[PDB]
């Protein structure tokens, strides 16, 4: 079964961080223990997780938008080909990265999207 | 065989607007003429279009990012299923609509990306 302070559910092991770090640092921390920031596949998983969280805490999930390139589309559905474009220097603007957190509102538990560099606690998951 | 005010290049007909309208209204104006906002497929096409433009003007192209929902990704590549999510009400934040324009910098001609609601001139294209 699951290692030392990890919590077991179905075929997975869950770790709850006490430290507040960026999403990237949170992912690295999970990674070093052989895990990932939590991927929530089902309602039942969501429910298990929230029972193991504290209402006075807020946590990164393993859900993000890496930003960068926008998904440019031609209006007639011609596929966008980045190698045949004529953007001025400095253009186009990159999409900002976004990161999901889970936390409690008086609505109860749910996800919110925030800037990835804001420090939050975090939740790791790996296979048992 | 492009009708009077339309200009002819390869197998296409091009119309240069005088009016300044949102991207969406600009597309509708092209559309009711049997056309679309211009889709630029090659360097030759870019070059032709430039010949028909005024350097004191800036024009919508038929290239956009229709915004809406971010391309959320689970960190272990599990596909995002929008029907198994637990966003708090009013979350996540919608992505803004972005649209390409073509204009002149003294760099010369190139594309910029702006918000789709700002009125600009426009370029329509249709098959010959």
From Swiss-Prot, chains A, B:
Segments on the Extracellular side according to the record's topology features: 2-128
Keywords: Adaptive immunity, Calcium, Cell membrane, Disulfide bond, Glycoprotein, Immunity, Innate immunity, Lectin, Membrane, Metal-binding, Signal-anchor, Transmembrane, Transmembrane helix
Gene Ontology process terms (BP): adaptive immune response; antifungal innate immune response
Tissue: Expressed in plasmacytoid dendritic cells (PDCs). Constitutively expressed in immature monocyte-derived dendritic cells (iMDDC) and is significantly down-regulated upon maturation with LPS but not with TNF-alpha.
Impact reported for residue 105 to A: Significantly impairs carbohydrate binding for the trisaccharide Gal(beta1-3/4)GlcNAc(beta1-2)Man
GO molecular function terms noted in the UniProt entry: carbohydrate binding; metal ion binding; pattern recognition receptor activity
Topology of the protein relative to the lipid bilayer: Single-pass type II membrane protein
Domain C-type lectin: 9-125
Intrachain disulfide bonds: 2-13, 30-124, 99-116
GO cellular component: external side of plasma membrane; ficolin-1-rich granule membrane; plasma membrane; secretory granule membrane; tertiary granule membrane
Binding-site residues, a carbohydrate: 58, 97, 103-105, 112-113, 120
List of glycosylated residues: 29, 56, 83
Binding of Ca(2+), residues: 91, 93, 97, 112-113
Subcellular localization(s) per the UniProt record: Cell membrane
Entry superkingdom: Eukaryota
Subunit structure, interactors included: Homodimer.
Function noted in UniProt: Lectin-type cell surface receptor which may play a role in antigen capturing by dendritic cells. Specifically recognizes non-sialylated galactose-terminated biantennary glycans containing the trisaccharide epitope Gal(beta1-3/4)GlcNAc(beta1-2)Man. Binds to serum IgG. Efficiently targets ligand into antigen-processing and peptide-loading compartments for presentation to T-cells. May mediate potent inhibition of induction of IFN-alpha/beta expression in plasmacytoid dendritic cells. May act as a signaling receptor that activates protein-tyrosine kinases and mobilizes intracellular calcium.
Protein name: C-type lectin domain family 4 member C
Organism: Homo sapiens (Human)
């Amino acid at each position: 079964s699951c290692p030392t302070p990890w919590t077991s559910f179905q075929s997975s092991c869950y770790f709850i961080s006490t430290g507040m770090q960026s999403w990237t640092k949170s992912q690295k921390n999970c990674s070093v223990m052989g895990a990932d920031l939590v991927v929530i596949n089902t309602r039942e998983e969501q429910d298990f997780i929230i029972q193991n969280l504290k209402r006075n805490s807020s946590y990164f999930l393993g859900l993000s938008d890496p930003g960068g390139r926008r998904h440019w589309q031609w209006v007639d559905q011609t596929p966008y080909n980045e190698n045949v474009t004529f953007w001025h220097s400095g253009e186009p603007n990159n999409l900002d990265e976004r990161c999901a957190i889970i936390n409690f509102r008086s609505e109860e538990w749910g996800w919110n999207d925030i800037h990835c560099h804001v420090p939050q606690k975090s939740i790791c998951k790996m296979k048992k």
